[PDB]
Amino acid sequence: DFILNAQVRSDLGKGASRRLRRNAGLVPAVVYGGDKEPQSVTLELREIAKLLENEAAFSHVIALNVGGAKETVLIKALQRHPAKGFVMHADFLRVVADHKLTAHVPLHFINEEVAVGVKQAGGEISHTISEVEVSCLPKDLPEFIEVDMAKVELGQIVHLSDLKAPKGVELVQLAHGNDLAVANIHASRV
Amino acid sequence: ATVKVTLVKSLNGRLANHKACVKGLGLRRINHTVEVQDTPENRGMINKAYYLLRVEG
Amino acid sequence: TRNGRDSESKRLGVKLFGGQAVKAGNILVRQRGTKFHAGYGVGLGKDHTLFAKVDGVVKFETKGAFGRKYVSIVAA
Amino acid sequence: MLQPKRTKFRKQMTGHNRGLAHRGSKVSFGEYALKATSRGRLTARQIESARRALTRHVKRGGKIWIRVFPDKPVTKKPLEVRMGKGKGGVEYWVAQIQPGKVLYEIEGVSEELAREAFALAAAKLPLATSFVKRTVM
RNA sequence: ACCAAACCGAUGCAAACUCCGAAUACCCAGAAGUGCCGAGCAUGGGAGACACACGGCGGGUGCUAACGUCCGUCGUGAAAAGGGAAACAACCCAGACCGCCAGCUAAGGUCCCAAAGUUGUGGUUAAGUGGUAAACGAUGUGGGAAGGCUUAGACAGCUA
RNA sequence: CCUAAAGAGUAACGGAGGAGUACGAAGGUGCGCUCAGACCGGUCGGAAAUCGGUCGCAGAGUAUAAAGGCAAAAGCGCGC
RNA sequence: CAACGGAUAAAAGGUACUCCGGGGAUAACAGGCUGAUACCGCCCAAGAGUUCAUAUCGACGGCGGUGUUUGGCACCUCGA
RNA sequence: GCUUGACGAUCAUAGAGCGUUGGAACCACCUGAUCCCUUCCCGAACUCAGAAGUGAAACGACGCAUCGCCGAUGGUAGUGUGGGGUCUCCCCAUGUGAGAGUAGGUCAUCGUCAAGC
Ligand SMILES: [Mg+2]
Ligand SMILES: [Mg+2]
Ligand SMILES: [Mg+2]
Ligand SMILES: [Mg+2]
Ligand SMILES: [Mg+2]
Ligand SMILES: [Mg+2]
Ligand SMILES: [Mg+2]
Ligand SMILES: [Mg+2]
Ligand SMILES: [Mg+2]
Ligand SMILES: [Mg+2]
Ligand SMILES: [Mg+2]
Ligand SMILES: [Mg+2]
Ligand SMILES: [Mg+2]
Ligand SMILES: [Mg+2]
Ligand SMILES: [Mg+2]
Ligand SMILES: [Mg+2]
Ligand SMILES: [Mg+2]
Ligand SMILES: [Mg+2]
Ligand SMILES: [Mg+2]
Ligand SMILES: [Mg+2]
Ligand SMILES: [Mg+2]
Ligand SMILES: [Mg+2]
Ligand SMILES: [Mg+2]
Ligand SMILES: [Mg+2]
Ligand SMILES: [Mg+2]
Ligand SMILES: [Mg+2]
Ligand SMILES: [Mg+2]
Ligand SMILES: [Mg+2]
Ligand SMILES: [Mg+2]
Ligand SMILES: [Mg+2]
Ligand SMILES: [Mg+2]
Ligand SMILES: [Mg+2]
Ligand SMILES: [Mg+2]
Ligand SMILES: [Mg+2]
Ligand SMILES: [Mg+2]
Ligand SMILES: [Mg+2]
Ligand SMILES: [Mg+2]
Ligand SMILES: [Mg+2]
Ligand SMILES: [Mg+2]
Ligand SMILES: [Mg+2]
Ligand SMILES: [Mg+2]
Ligand SMILES: [Mg+2]
Ligand SMILES: [Mg+2]
Ligand SMILES: [Mg+2]
Ligand SMILES: [Mg+2]
Ligand SMILES: [Mg+2]
Ligand SMILES: [Mg+2]
Ligand SMILES: [Mg+2]
Ligand SMILES: [Mg+2]
Ligand SMILES: [Mg+2]
Ligand SMILES: [Mg+2]
Ligand SMILES: [Mg+2]
Ligand SMILES: [Mg+2]
Ligand SMILES: [Mg+2]
Ligand SMILES: [Mg+2]
Ligand SMILES: [Mg+2]
Ligand SMILES: [Mg+2]
Ligand SMILES: [Mg+2]
Ligand SMILES: [Mg+2]
Ligand SMILES: [Mg+2]
Ligand SMILES: [Mg+2]
Ligand SMILES: [Mg+2]
């Protein structure tokens, strides 16, 4: 499932990283977090890009196998080529059982077709945001947060306070007194 | 202790900074070899003009 | 065109850099306003020129509140 | 067309267009986007021409964003005029494009309808483009 | 059911914006060696010159047009022959005191004109591509990572 | 002021603006004090006059363009 | 004395009736470089064509070619 | 060493916000305007004479990261020298290397003197 193999990287810099991408088909990467000194690793380009196609590739914990050592890890950030779109770099956050981790989690809009604002009012559905930033312990990190639009009329706004998170999950942005909009129903363009 | 240094390329058209690095080692013309002590001051002129020289060691 | 005007340059800036030996009356900075402030042993002219009142070397330090930049003279 | 309501200065130096677009290279609002893969500049008549060719093909719902704004004035010297005698007058407004910049966005349509409509828009633009999808990171 | 300052969040741009911020280049001091035997400075005798050109890098202007024009900084020509780029001031290699029917190399080259590999190993091209060219178009051909159907009968054909 | 390439300097019939003054106090010194703006309450004003309170930190001011400065304020007032 | 290092205290024009010394250091003709413009092709396809995008055309936009017009420059020729 | 004052060092990892707490001394509020001194009016502020009251306000001490402020590692951008390309822009070798963001820190640390134990 979510398993990666990586090797230790000892050659650093602009020149060494360019030779990894050009002549070896590898990707530089870093593992930090927990309570340890950070470590520099390297991994296959065609291996990381295959896992990224999975929907829950950023809201799931991954078993990283560096050398023979196995440790549990979550994907924190990801650098991509601005034009071609492939991954150039990635950093990995170590996972500890009792410590809060702050991650991005995708949303799921269900039963959009039965929306009250759609069938009767004839209005469109617009998703203002498609992912939300959460914070929780690893044991209760969800693969997605599910938002329904069954009881939504025309002109109605869905906010962060409206949707409900699983037990032990906190919405970060809502804590800072900012409930940004999630979705709405509006009149047709024409 | 010391190090072989040999001038293999011409000095014509080089940067004035690089001409003084070759002259500071005692090199006069192509295929001419000198003895210079391996000190950080002498190494710095060798590195600045690395492409004009052959360092046998 | 109605643009072809300009004024002659004034040759401002730092005249003596940090660590240089100085003598009394030496001009250190030419300024508009006070980018640098007169530290110990340094006087200020009416066009904000910084000059040396004693002998020593330039120090240049950012200290105090307001984050000001000071030029002072210290004994070598 | 598109141009600033007012500007601090009437003219600008030509400058240079270098680098990649690290900022503005994500699908920030919609689900699909048209992204530039070569460097050039759009003249605010190609932007309007490509917008009308894009919204017409949909004609049923959907939200459309434009992420490029022409804010650089360019001059032109009239015919039969010698060199010098001051800078020329402003004729049109342009936007600098670096490789990897998102040009248009759309949501509320199928992937195939967006893919067909962005093909029509790309035929009015003087630079290479590509079709991309929104991702978390 | 129109418009809506302001505020919150997301998201771009700036030679005459800056919460930031290099590499280089400039000053200063202390040191080893080299310097053609000097390099620096001062004071006097004699000048010439004050129409520059191209190439690279950083810019304004022009159309990021011109063997255009105007600046900064290097190199060459001017005032520099020799070899190479077919011929070709300014490009690359290299700075001619004289002589030799001696040798080694640089850039560039090794089938013939014409000096030197019809050299060796593995592949690609069929277009004289090589030996001029853009949007766009195409079952050309080689390589790679993956997919939708299908022996419970996939696609093309035939027998009603 | 930009061009001007983070020391100085640097051209174009390049891009933008000002000057050919003012002040016997608008100078010296000692002492003393902080603006713009917002909100609330308050008679004719009501958005804005003078007033009281809270926040505010320079978004004000500087004789005159722009740039660089200004808490020991270089800003404001009074006596000599 | 602003033509702001200020020729004198004191100064405007015509020459197709013209003249001399010079210059391709500098224009007009032709040549050269360039190709904004010009001309000729191609790409997209809203639309016109009773219906039907491409029989025939083709808006808004894009990419080239030729030196072929109007230009830009001032490299050759002012002892023709 | 424990508490309070005065003067410094250094200028947010030191600030802001919220809460608890301090009166024996010190300090602050406090009483009065006769006497020095004062208000472009007012003992409000400055000043004088004080010892009835309080720690309310102010100030200090102590806790908390919500804000503010610091902030890696790695990667990316740029860049000196030499060399290349399909040369408006890039790549290679070598040296250098941000800004932003991420993990994460921060409710400061000192010096001299005088008073209470
Ligand atoms: Mg490099
Ligand atoms: Mg050379
Ligand atoms: Mg001008
Ligand atoms: Mg100038
Ligand atoms: Mg200047
Ligand atoms: Mg004085
Ligand atoms: Mg320019
Ligand atoms: Mg940018
Ligand atoms: Mg700038
Ligand atoms: Mg000699
Ligand atoms: Mg002259
Ligand atoms: Mg002279
Ligand atoms: Mg001259
Ligand atoms: Mg000249
Ligand atoms: Mg010149
Ligand atoms: Mg020249
Ligand atoms: Mg140039
Ligand atoms: Mg130029
Ligand atoms: Mg040119
Ligand atoms: Mg020229
Ligand atoms: Mg040059
Ligand atoms: Mg030169
Ligand atoms: Mg020479
Ligand atoms: Mg000459
Ligand atoms: Mg020659
Ligand atoms: Mg030759
Ligand atoms: Mg020859
Ligand atoms: Mg040739
Ligand atoms: Mg060779
Ligand atoms: Mg032969
Ligand atoms: Mg053979
Ligand atoms: Mg072969
Ligand atoms: Mg051929
Ligand atoms: Mg051919
Ligand atoms: Mg400068
Ligand atoms: Mg410089
Ligand atoms: Mg000059
Ligand atoms: Mg004027
Ligand atoms: Mg004043
Ligand atoms: Mg100012
Ligand atoms: Mg003060
Ligand atoms: Mg004159
Ligand atoms: Mg004059
Ligand atoms: Mg004169
Ligand atoms: Mg006359
Ligand atoms: Mg004559
Ligand atoms: Mg004559
Ligand atoms: Mg000529
Ligand atoms: Mg002339
Ligand atoms: Mg003719
Ligand atoms: Mg002509
Ligand atoms: Mg053309
Ligand atoms: Mg029709
Ligand atoms: Mg041509
Ligand atoms: Mg012709
Ligand atoms: Mg010329
Ligand atoms: Mg001729
Ligand atoms: Mg003639
Ligand atoms: Mg003749
Ligand atoms: Mg780093
Ligand atoms: Mg950093
Ligand atoms: Mg920061």
Short mmCIF file of C-alpha atoms (C1' of nucleotides) and ligand atoms in Angstrom, two decimals, chain G residues 24-27 74-77, ligand 48:
data_model
loop_
_atom_site.label_atom_id
_atom_site.label_comp_id
_atom_site.label_asym_id
_atom_site.label_seq_id
_atom_site.Cartn_x
_atom_site.Cartn_y
_atom_site.Cartn_z
"C1'" G G 24 30.65 60.35 -49.36
"C1'" A G 25 33.00 63.13 -41.63
"C1'" U G 26 26.53 64.61 -44.25
"C1'" A G 27 21.27 64.70 -47.64
"C1'" A G 74 23.95 56.23 -43.23
"C1'" C G 75 28.20 51.22 -45.04
"C1'" C G 76 30.04 52.84 -51.08
"C1'" U G 77 30.39 56.97 -54.71
MG MG I 48 28.99 57.39 -45.33
#
